[PDB]
Amino acid sequence: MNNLYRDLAPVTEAAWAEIELEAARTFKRHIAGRRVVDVSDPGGPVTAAVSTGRLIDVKAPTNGVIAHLRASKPLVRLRVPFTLSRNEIDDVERGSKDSDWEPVKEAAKKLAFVEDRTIFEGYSAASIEGIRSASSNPALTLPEDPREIPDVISQALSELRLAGVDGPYSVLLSADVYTKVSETSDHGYPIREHLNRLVDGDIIWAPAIDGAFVLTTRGGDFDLQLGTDVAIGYASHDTDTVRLYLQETLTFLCYTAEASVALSHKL
Amino acid sequence: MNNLYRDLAPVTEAAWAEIELEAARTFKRHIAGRRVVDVSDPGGPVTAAVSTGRLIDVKAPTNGVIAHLRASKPLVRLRVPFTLSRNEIDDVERGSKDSDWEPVKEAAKKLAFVEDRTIFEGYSAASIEGIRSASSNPALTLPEDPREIPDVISQALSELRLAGVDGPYSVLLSADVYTKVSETSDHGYPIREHLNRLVDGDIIWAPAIDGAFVLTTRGGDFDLQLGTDVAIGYASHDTDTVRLYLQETLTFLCYTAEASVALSH
Amino acid sequence: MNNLYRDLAPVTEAAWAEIELEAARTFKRHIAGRRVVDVSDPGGPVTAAVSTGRLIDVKAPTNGVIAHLRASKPLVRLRVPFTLSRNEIDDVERGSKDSDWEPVKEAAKKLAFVEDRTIFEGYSAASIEGIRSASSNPALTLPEDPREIPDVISQALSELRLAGVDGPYSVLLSADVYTKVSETSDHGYPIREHLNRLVDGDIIWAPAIDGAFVLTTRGGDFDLQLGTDVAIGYASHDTDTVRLYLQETLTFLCYTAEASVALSHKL
Amino acid sequence: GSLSIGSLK
Amino acid sequence: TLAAGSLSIGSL
Ligand code: NI
Ligand code: NI
Ligand code: NI
Ligand code: NI
Ligand code: NI
Ligand code: NI
Structure with missing residues (x-):
């Protein structure tokens, strides 16, 4: 087996299929960065760091020697546990299509x-600076009138063009901003139709972030280094419940500061 | 080597690739004339002038001889130096993708x-008049209300059609006017959709120019004669920095005065 | 070219051959760990860390997530510069075999x-624990009478055997201890002959260390992870001198504490 | 599917 | 000579 120890879990092959399908489509619905950043191939469970190629001054061993430490970006392992009812698991083989996979969906959403x-926002505990923090372009404020959103997107796009950034530009909207753009109509004309003619890329539903982002999808600017992609593992079980988990080992790197424009609300 | 002396620069093959890629795409993003003018093939480093075919009266050598000088537009060499950190250059081979190429991008933008x-505006020191100065068509003023931009474009287009000018018409907008056209909506209707339905060509992002231009892309009217296209050369270096440069040898010629309409504030 | 920029150095092809030969054989004479530890294949200039496979507890991003950082041992770049006379370099092509390569030999020795x-002793600035510090076996003291060296070596060997450690055992001696073992004779019988009958491996001349070490060469206990092996690079030059350097990027890892026995003099 | 897969665009 | 330059010491 592997570190997931899936073979030790009291889960039917039929139940495994339902659990894996639900986790897959639920994760894809909430995810939005994997649609604009460069996601690498899984390097394997041995992957622990990503070389940034930079040198770090360190105390020399003796006189006449110049010593430098090789800088690298560490990988972080994210593990989201959830608990399933063994009755719901055993119901799958008996022909049940309404088994409670809500803990699976909640773990995928988390x-x-x-x-x-x-x-996009960062993870200081893993030395991962967010895109918003690294964005060298002037951040913008979302207007109070949603009919003025095309104005702020147009200025954000011009900031990217004025920074020498090329490539198909995409716009990631938060759950609230996406709903606003979908419903807002300036004198009956839907503002999302206005935005679709301004964005050569896509307008992505990004419920995890807050505010909005305007970035390029030319490639080589945002790097999601995968060591281990999303997987379902087994932890423990009794006669009534099974403790599984969603696990992932990755890190994020932002190579181009001017390749993004961050947008936020006001307080 | 050549006059670039690239082989003498302490720059790794890996760093050269990223430096050239960054300079190329940054130059292409800020450039907007090569999308409406006729860009020729590079004539070589020997190219120094473009024959204008015209004659110039000059003092005869003796009586009975009619002497004329052959007029020609000279080429100008543009050279934008920049300095790179050798630490950022050496980081590339070690696996760095965030090396500081801002001097490369700033030189490309310049x-x-x-x-x-x-x-578009001219270069009198190089005998380059420009599209705006040579445009025989009546210049127009961009309106204060951005919702009236389709009015001024329609009149600019009509000026070209009334001058016997054909070909796909294109509109080059400055950075400010382009952003205004992208955001302005007359009663919710985006004015860029109105403009796209009036222009059979393209609406080009032209951040270097001021105002706007409406010209034809039929060909044979605006000639960007390249002697040497954009290249990266090596000047000098120490133990900490390398001084490179973006170089280009070219000239511009405007053959048809009525083929363009200039717009300003 | 690469980061060494060797092509920019005013050094003849003939001089490069002699300079590289001298650095190679000089380094081989003073080095003594590459003869008992596992030296890995050069991972390339991109190599920056070695996965230690362990996890490091880190603050969770949100509730319900168990976050751990992947641990990694960093690589250190060692660079020993030296300066050569351009007259000595240009003499090589003219047929000189007595060119002054002493800066090369001193850089190789360093x-x-x-x-x-x-x-063996460690490099705390690079998070590299020495074999002596990591040796869980009881350290021993070299006797005052050199004729009692076989006694302390025998007890060191028994410490390895009593710790379940197998493999060909080797003994690394410092410059002073090696010379003593070579010259000392107990009632005329050379004590080095006694040691050669006690060591199934080799008795290695280790001038860089002090004291002595008795370890196993079975493999898998001492890991010298090479990213870039020792090479000669170019820094700068004038009309009289050239500044070159020996560069190396590596780390050391000790996986088995009981696989070695350290020995030192009586303080 | 299988847990999840990157490069969704 | 005038290239890479790894003396290729390795395991001795
Ligand atoms: Ni709003
Ligand atoms: Ni349990
Ligand atoms: Ni005359
Ligand atoms: Ni002339
Ligand atoms: Ni934790
Ligand atoms: Ni000879």
């Missing part, structure tokens, strides 16, 4: 939110 | 802006 | 000593 928040 | 302003 | 000291 892991997806942690990942997108790590990419 | 060289691109010099070229576009030379094409 | 880099070799730094490496063995890092392997």
Whole structure:
């Protein structure tokens, strides 16, 4: 087996299929960074750091020697446990299609939110600076009148163009801002139709973030280094419940500061 | 080597690749004239002038001889130096993707802006008049109300059609006017959709120019004669920095005065 | 070219051959750890860390997430500069075999000593614990009478055997202890002959260390992870001198504490 | 599916 | 000579 120890879990093959399908589509619904950043191939469970190529001054061993430490970006392991009812698991083989996978969906929503928040807002505990913090472009404020959103997106796009940044530009909207853009109509004309003619890329539903982001999808600017992609592992079980978990080992790196424009509300 | 002396620069092959990629795409993002003018093939480093075909009266050598000088537009060499940190250069081979190429991008933005302003606004020191100065069509004023921009574009287009000018018409907007067209909506209707339905060509982002231009892309009217296209050369270096440069040798010629309409504030 | 920029150095092809030969054989004479530890394949200039496989507890991003950082041992870049006379370099092509390569030999001796000291004594600035510090076996004192050296070596060997450690056992002696073992004779019988019958491996000349070490060469206990092996690079030059350097990027890891026995003089 | 897969666009 | 330059010491 592997570190997941999936073979030791009292879960039917049929139940495994339902659990894996639900976790997969639920994670994809809440996730949005994996649609604009460069996601690498899984490097394996041995992957523990990403070389940043930079040198770090360190005390020399003796005189006449110049010593430097090799800088690297560490990987963080995210593990979201959840508990399932063994009755719901055993019901799958008996023909049940309404088994309670809500703990599975909540773990997928949580892991997806942690990942997108790590990419865009940051994760200081893992030395991961967010895109918003690294954005060298002037941040903008979302207007109070939603009919003025095309104005702020247009200025954000011009900031990217004035910084020498190319590539198909995409706009990531938070759950509240996305709903606002979908419903707002300036004199009946829907403002999302206005935005669709301004964005050569896509307008992405990003529920984990807050505010909005305007970035490029040319590639080579945002790097999601995967060591271990999302997987379902087994922890423990009794005669009534099974403790599983969603696990992922990754880190994020932002190579181009001017490749993004952050947007936020006002307090 | 050549006059660039690239082989003498302490820059790794890996660093050269990223430096060239960054300079290339940054120059292409800020450039906007090569999308409406005719850019020729590079004539080589020997290219020094472009024949204008015209004759110039000059003093005869003796009686009975009619002497004329062959008029020609000279080429100008633009050279934008920049300095890179050797730590950032050496970091590339060690696996760094965040090396500081801002001096490369700033040199690209400067060289691109010099070229576009030379094409559209002129460069008198190089005998380059420019599209705006040579445009025989009546210049227009951009309106204060951005919702009236379709009015001024429609009149600019009508000026070209009334001058016998054909071809796909294109509109080049400055950074401020382009952002205004993208955001302005007349009663919710985006004015860019109105403009896109009036322009059979493209609406080009032209950050280096000021105002706007409406011209034809039929060909044969605006000629950007390249002797040497944009390249990266090596100047000098120490133990900490390398001084490189973006170089280009070109000239611009405007053959048709009525082929363009200039707009300003 | 690469980060060494060797092509920019005013050094003849003939001089490069002699300079590289001298550095190679000089480094090989003073080095003594690369003969008992596991030296890995060069991972390349991109290599910056070695996964230790362990997790480090870190603050969770939100509730319900268990976050751990992947541990990694960093690589250190050692660079020993030296200066050569351009007259000595240009003499090589003219047929000189007495060119002054002493700066090369001193840089090789310095880099070799730094490496063995890092392997056996440690390098705290680079988070590299020495073999002596990590040795869980009881350390021993070299006797005052050199004719009693076989006694302390025999007890060191028994310490390894009593710890379940197998493999060909080797003994690394410092410059002073090695010379004493070579010259000392107990009633005319050379004590080195006694030691050669006690060691199934080799008795290694280790001038960089002090004291002595008795360890196993079975493999998998001492790991010298090479990112870039020792190479000669170019820094700067004028009309009279050239500044070159020996560069190396590596780390050391000790996986088995009981696989070695350290010995020192009586303080 | 299988847990999840990157490169969703 | 005038290239890479790894003396290729390795395991001795
Ligand atoms: Ni709003
Ligand atoms: Ni349990
Ligand atoms: Ni005449
Ligand atoms: Ni002339
Ligand atoms: Ni924790
Ligand atoms: Ni000879």
